[PDB]
Write a protein that binds this ligand. Structure first.
Ligand code: PAR
Ligand code: MG
Ligand code: MG
Ligand code: MG
Ligand code: MG
Ligand code: MG
Ligand code: MG
Ligand code: MG
Ligand code: MG
Ligand code: MG
Ligand code: MG
Ligand code: MG
Ligand code: MG
Ligand code: MG
Ligand code: MG
Ligand code: MG
Ligand code: MG
Lengths: 98, 78, 60, 24, 206
RNA sequence: AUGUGGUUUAAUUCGAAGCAACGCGAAGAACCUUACCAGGCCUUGACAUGCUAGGGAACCCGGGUGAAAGCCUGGGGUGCCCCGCGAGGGGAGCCCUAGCACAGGUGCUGCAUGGCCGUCGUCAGCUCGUGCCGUGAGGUGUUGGGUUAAGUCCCGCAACGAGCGCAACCCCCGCCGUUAGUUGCCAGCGGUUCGGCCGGGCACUCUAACGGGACUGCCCGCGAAAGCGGGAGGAAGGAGGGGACGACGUCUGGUCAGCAUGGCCCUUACGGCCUGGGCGACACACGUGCUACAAUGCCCACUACAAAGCGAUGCCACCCGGCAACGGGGAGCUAAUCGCAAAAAGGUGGGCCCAGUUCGGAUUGGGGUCUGCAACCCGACCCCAUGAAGCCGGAAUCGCUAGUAAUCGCGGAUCAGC
C-alpha cells in the first residue's frame, strides 16, 4: 500500500541508504516487495575544452540520476518509526506515495 | 506574415489620425519602418529612417499592404 | 562593455524576448548551459574541481 | 526527393507534417 | 597545452566531491550559485587560517559546510567569537539555516592546496623562486609522502621573459586512477603580474 | 546552406591563418544578443566602498514631450531617533542635488602573463641517482642479439637501480551467477469485452547493483629465454571490441573578446542609455557541407523491425474545424506508468516507362499559419501556381581496414522562434 521512490547521484548511497530501509521494515513489521532498481537518467554535456576555437577536441560530462524503488504492503506503526524520522539521509531523495 | 492586426505603431497612427482631423504636413518623420501602411493613410509624406537619415517616401494607393521600410533602403550601391 | 551588461541582463526588460542567459561566474553570453547558469568554460573548471555534484567524466 | 516539400520524404527530412504527410 | 585536472580525472574513485547534495533539474541551478558565492566569501575572509577543502552537504533548508583548515584557532576566536560572526554572515545570503563544522588538517604539508598557497605566499614576498619550490617539495617529502611535485609558471623573479620552474620527488603517477594525488593551485598576484603555482602530492593506492 | 578571402559600406564589430584558420570562438545575430555605424540622449554614472555639504529625508499617483532613452513637471507624503521640549532642531536609516576619492572601458600589448587549449603524438620516447670511462663537452645505463602495439618483455653487458612515460588500476560493450518484482509474461494454469487486460507468477526478457569469467592456465610444434605458429575447451583468446587517459619538451602556436592579470591609453568620452541600421552588402575567389543528376530508381497506399534521450514559464494522447501549417476544445504524465514517437531504409500491392521525365526542387508570383512588442531591410512552416542548373563533374584532391565504409532514420544541447 506504501510506495517510496529513491533518487540520487550516488549509487552506493542508495544501495546503502535504501537497503537499510529493508531491515527497518522487515524486522519491525510485515511484507516488503524488495528494493527495485530503476532506469537511470543520464544527462551528458559536451564541452569544447579550450576557451577559444578548437572546435574538434572536447570533453564529455554526464550527470547520472540513479532511481530505486521500494514497496511495503502492511502499514504498522511498529514500522513508521525508523520509517518516519530515524534519519540517515545524506545526499539522497525521498518520495513517499500510496 | 500575421492576420490579427497589422501591428502598426500607435505613435505613428495616433500622429497620422490626429493629423487627418485637418492635417497636410510633410515634416512627418519616423523611425518605425516596422509598421504596415494602414488603410489609405496615403497623401501624406512620411520620412523613414534607413539608420542614417530619413528619406521622404511619398505614400500612394497602390502600395498599401506593404511596410514602411520597404521604401527606406538601408545599404549603398547594391 | 562586459560590466554595464552583466548588470543589464538581470534587469527585467520591456518584452520578455529581450531577455537572456549569462555564465553567472565568467560573465558570459554564449554556450551557457541553462541547467547550471554556467558558460562551457567556467563549468569544465568546476566540473573538474568536484564543485558540481554527481557530475563526472563521461566515458562510453 | 529529400529536397522537395511536396513529397512525403521532403517533409520527413524537414521534420514537418502537412497534406503530403499527415499525422495518421 | 596538454594534461587533465587530476581531481576531475579521479572523482568517481580515489577522490570524492566538494559538494554532496542531490537536486532536481530546477533547484540545482540555484543550489549551485549559492554553493559558490559561499566559497567566494569563505575563502576570501579566511586566508589566514589556511583552508584546504570547503566540503558541503544539503537536506532541504539546512547546509553542512564542513570547512577543513590547518589553524582551527583562527576561525573560532578564543571561545567562539568569530564562528558566530560567520554563521551570522552566511544566512544573510543563504536564506536557510547554515550549520558549520570545522576540521583540523592534521598535517598541512600533505594538503596540496596549502603547499601551493605556502609557495605562492613566499613568491609575493619576493622570495627565492627556485628554492621555495625545492624546500616545499622537501617539506612534503619530509612529512612522509610517497612523492610530490611543484610547478611555478613565469615571470619568475620579475624577469622579462616568462619561464617555468618545477621540482619533484618520489612518484607522482598522474596516469594511475588508483593513485590519490591531492592536487592544488594557488595564484600569486605580484608587482609584475601573475605567477601560477601547482602542487601534487602522492600518497594513496588500493 | 554555411565559414573565409576580396570588394563594397555610414557600419559591413573583433578575433582565428599551412598541416594545427576557413559549418572555427558563435551549443541559436530580427529588437536582446552587440563589442559596429547614424542619430536622440546620461553624465559620481547601469555596478562596489568611503568622504566634504545646503536641500528633502520610508513612499505613492499622474501629466506634458519624445522614436525610445531621457528630460520639463503637478500632486498625494510625514511614519523614526529623539522628550532635549508639555511651542519640537541635532546631516540615525533613507533619498536627492553640488563638489571629492573613485567606478567604467570587449580601448592596445598573447612578444610582459596565469589559466585553459591546439600541436608534433598516444608517437616510444625523455630523464635521474650512484658507480664506471673521458683533460673536457660528454659518454655508459638507454648500445648489442631476440621480441612486442610499446624503453613490452627476454638474454647478454661497467653498470646497479629508479622516476616521468608504455601497460595496468577506471567507464561502455560481449557470456554466466547472486540480490531485487506497478517494466516481463499462457513460460505454466485459470478466467479474457481476446489489448498481458484481469486475478495471479519471476521462470524468461529486461532494469541496476554486486560477483564470477581469461591466466598463454591446457595440448602440438619452434626457442636459451621472452615469445612465435598451430590445436582443444570456452560467450569470449594471446591487447576480445570501443572509451577515458597526452612523458621532458616543441612551436616566442592560440586566446588580454570567457575569466584572471603586469604595463600603456580614454574619463560631459575610447564610459553609459536608447531607437534605428549593420554584423545578412555582392563583379568576384576558396574551404566545409546539403540536394541532386534517377528504374539497385521516383511517387501513392497498406504493413510493427526494434534501439539511446527529452518533457509541469513543459511533452500534449483523443475528439472536432481547416487541403494543410495550425486553431478549438481536452485526458494522462513530477514520467521504465503518460507524451514527443512516424522510425526511415525494409516488406506487400499499385502507378510512372528512360523523358531534363511523375528524375531534380533552385528561382519567382500569390494566399495563408505560428513564435514574438515587432518578422521591410532579416524568421521558420503550410498550401496554389512557377518548375532553374543539373545526364555523375578539368587539372588537382578527401575519408574509410568491420559492425568500419556506404546508406536510413531517431534524440539532445543552445533555444520565444530560427
Ligand atoms: N584528450 C585529447 C583528445 O584526443 C583526440 O584523439 C586523437 C588521438 O588520441 C587519436 O588517435 C590517433 C590519431 O590521431 C592518429 N591520426 C592515428 C593514430 N592511429 C590514432 O591512434 C589510435 O590508436 C591508439 C592506440 O592504439 C588509441 O589509443 C588512439 O586513441 C587511437 N585514436 O586520434 C585523434 C587525433 O587524430 C584528439 N587527438 C584531440 O583532438 C583531443 O585533444
Ligand atoms: Mg567541424
Ligand atoms: Mg553592388
Ligand atoms: Mg533570445
Ligand atoms: Mg520531384
Ligand atoms: Mg583584439
Ligand atoms: Mg604564446
Ligand atoms: Mg598562454
Ligand atoms: Mg594574434
Ligand atoms: Mg674524472
Ligand atoms: Mg618500462
Ligand atoms: Mg624495441
Ligand atoms: Mg595508459
Ligand atoms: Mg605571436
Ligand atoms: Mg541597437
Ligand atoms: Mg557572421
Ligand atoms: Mg536521364
Amino acid at each position: 500500500k506504501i510506495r517510496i521512490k529513491l533518487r540520487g547521484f550516488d549509487h552506493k548511497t542508495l544501495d546503502a541508504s535504501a537497503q537499510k530501509i529493508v531491515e527497518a521494515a522487515r524486522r519491525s513489521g510485515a511484507q516488503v516487495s524488495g528494493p527495485i532498481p530503476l532506469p537511470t537518467r543520464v544527462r551528458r554535456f559536451t564541452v569544447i575544452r579550450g576557451p577559444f576555437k578548437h572546435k574538434d577536441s572536447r570533453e564529455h560530462f554526464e550527470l547520472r540520476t540513479h532511481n530505486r524503488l521500494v514497496d511495503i504492503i502492511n502499514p504498522n506503526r511498529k514500522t513508521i518509526e525508523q520509517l518516519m524520522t530515524l534519519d540517515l539521509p545524506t545526499g539522497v531523495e525521498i518520495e513517499i506515495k500510496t | 506574415s500575421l492576420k490579427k492586426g497589422v501591428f502598426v505603431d500607435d505613435h505613428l497612427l495616433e500622429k497620422v489620425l490626429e493629423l487627418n482631423a485637418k492635417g497636410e504636413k510633410r515634416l512627418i518623420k519616423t523611425w518605425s519602418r516596422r509598421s504596415t501602411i494602414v488603410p489609405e493613410m496615403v497623401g501624406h509624406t512620411i520620412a523613414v529612417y534607413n539608420g542614417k537619415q530619413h528619406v521622404p517616401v511619398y505614400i500612394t494607393e497602390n502600395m498599401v499592404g506593404h511596410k514602411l521600410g520597404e521604401f527606406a533602403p538601408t545599404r549603398t550601391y547594391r | 562593455a562586459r560590466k554595464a551588461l552583466i548588470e543589464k541582463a538581470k534587469r527585467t526588460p520591456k518584452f520578455k524576448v529581450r531577455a537572456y542567459t549569462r555564465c553567472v561566474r565568467c560573465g558570459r553570453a554564449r554556450s551557457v548551459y541553462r541547467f547550471f547558469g554556467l558558460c562551457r568554460i567556467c563549468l569544465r573548471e568546476l566540473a573538474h574541481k568536484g564543485q558540481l555534484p554527481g557530475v563526472r567524466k563521461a566515458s562510453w | 526527393g529529400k529536397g522537395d516539400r511536396r513529397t512525403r520524404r521532403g517533409k520527413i527530412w524537414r521534420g514537418t507534417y502537412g497534406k503530403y504527410r499527415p499525422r495518421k | 597545452g596538454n594534461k587533465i585536472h587530476p581531481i576531475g580525472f579521479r572523482l568517481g574513485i580515489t577522490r570524492d566531491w566538494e559538494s554532496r547534495w542531490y537536486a532536481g533539474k530546477k533547484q540545482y541551478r540555484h543550489l549551485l550559485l549559492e554553493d559558490q558565492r559561499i566559497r567566494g566569501l569563505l575563502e576570501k575572509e579566511l586566508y589566514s587560517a589556511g583552508l584546504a577543502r570547503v566540503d558541503i552537504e544539503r537536506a532541504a533548508d539546512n547546509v553542512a559546510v564542513t570547512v577543513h583548515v590547518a589553524k582551527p584557532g583562527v576561525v573560532i576566536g578564543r571561545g567562539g567569537e568569530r564562528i558566530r560572526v560567520l554563521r551570522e554572515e552566511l544566512a544573510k545570503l543563504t536564506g536557510k539555516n547554515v550549520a558549520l563544522n570545522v576540521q583540523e588538517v592534521q598535517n598541512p604539508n600533505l594538503s596540496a592546496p596549502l603547499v601551493a598557497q605556502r609557495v605562492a605566499e613566499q613568491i609575493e614576498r619576493r622570495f627565492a623562486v627556485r628554492r621555495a619550490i625545492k624546500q616545499a617539495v622537501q617539506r612534503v617529502m619530509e612529512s612522509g609522502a610517497k612523492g610530490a611535485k611543484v610547478i611555478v609558471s613565469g615571470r619568475i623573479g620579475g624577469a622579462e621573459q616568462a619561464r617555468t620552474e618545477w621540482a619533484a620527488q618520489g612518484r607522482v603517477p598522474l596516469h594511475t586512477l588508483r593513485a590519490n594525488i591531492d592536487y592544488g593551485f594557488a595564484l600569486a598576484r605580484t608587482t609584475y603580474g601573475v605567477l601560477g603555482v601547482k602542487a601534487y602530492i602522492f600518497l594513496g593506492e588500493v
